Amino acid sequence: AVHYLNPESADLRALAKHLYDSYIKSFPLTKAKARAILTGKTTDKSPFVIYDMNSLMMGEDKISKEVAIRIFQGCQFRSVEAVQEITEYAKSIPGFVNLDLNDQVTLLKYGVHEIIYTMLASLMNKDGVLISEGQGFMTREFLKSLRKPFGDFMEPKFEFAVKFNALELDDSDLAIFIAVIILSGDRPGLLNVKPIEDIQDNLLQALELQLKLNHPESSQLFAKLLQKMTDLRQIVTEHVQLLQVIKKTETDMSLHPLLQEIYKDLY
User: Fold this and answer.
1) Dihedral pair phi/psi, residue 128, rounded to 5°
2) Binding site per annotation, positions
3) Which of 6, 79, 138, 203 is the most exposed place for a label (fewest CB within 10 A)?
4) In CATH, which of 1.10.565.10, 3.40.190.10, 3.30.300.10, 3.40.50.300 is domain 1-267?
């Protein structure tokens, strides 16, 4: 409830700057940029709106192949690419690199998806998603119209994004939040758990201090973020389920191998 400016709170503020710089340098599109585009104030940015099949095809001009599938495999590709960016960002979290290599992989392997939907929310609004780094905007209604199986793989994301963007976190907050998610000792298969929690503990303190200074008006964002952290795991779960329905239903369409390795160890 009360804070003093001590050497410990100073490092927590330093850690914040650090993860923030790594963040900006690890991800192409930040929430600041994303929201600017969605509110239309960017000059160089004005996404081509894909809101139907006709706009979809003419949109492919400005940057087994049925659309429902074509679009589905596009997401899995962006996902592995996203994985690589998350990984690069993870390596910049202090201590992460000193953990047993095996745990570093277990950590990413299990939390990359929780991070993927947290950051996807930055690119989402009640109307749709920004695709191809702000070059396109794909309408939410257009995604639900897709073929029987692929018409719901995105809807859960959207529902989450809306509730989530409600908290109005800025990239300052996300940089640390994402770090907390990664370094979770709950992950099955870790060798030495204590060192991981030690890092998370300190990350959680830094996050709370961040939220007090950055959101003077919000009474309890911290408690709310801790909750969003749980319903994130639920979304991943539901994602894996519906994802298995696509496997044993829709064939003549392949799931990227790197992703299937992660899905194997997910429930």
Assistant:
1) 170, -165
2) 76-79, 113, 239, 263
3) 6
4) 1.10.565.10
